Amino acid sequence: SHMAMKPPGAQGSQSTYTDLLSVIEEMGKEIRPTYAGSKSAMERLKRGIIHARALVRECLAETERNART
Amino acid sequence: SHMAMKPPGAQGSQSTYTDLLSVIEEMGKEIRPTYAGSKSAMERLKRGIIHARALVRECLAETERNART
């Protein structure tokens, strides 16, 4: 683990993978309307997990070949 | 069958990023009690996004070194 209290933001210029970074936040913000009983935002929140589940799965393939530090 | 194959760890070279694939689905399980008004589960859902977004930017460090899309 790494608690980035002093981060570089991200700046990982890899759009297809940065979709994953985006989706985490898109869900993260729409947790509040979901919690307020909005099934519309809840369905979007779910669909974010499906989107991000596929995102990680596809990236795993080349990240296996990458695995850099 | 179902369009969601789950490989735990074939080649050991995507291991920290495999944890992220777990976190995605573990946010998926928090959605239903969050929507049902459970503030504890909602906090676990948000802290799931905090965990997930961290793991993405951890990889973005090495993923900017990579350049596909």
From Swiss-Prot, chains A, B:
Keywords: Cytoplasm, Nucleus, Phosphoprotein. Residues 7-49 are annotated as: Interaction with CDK2. It is found in: Cytoplasm; Nucleus. Phosphorylated by MAPK1 and CDK2. GO terms for biological process: negative regulation of G1/S transition of mitotic cell cycle; regulation of microtubule cytoskeleton organization; regulation of stem cell division. Belongs to the CDK2AP family. This is Cyclin-dependent kinase 2-associated protein 2. The chain holds residues 61 to 126 of 126 of the full protein.
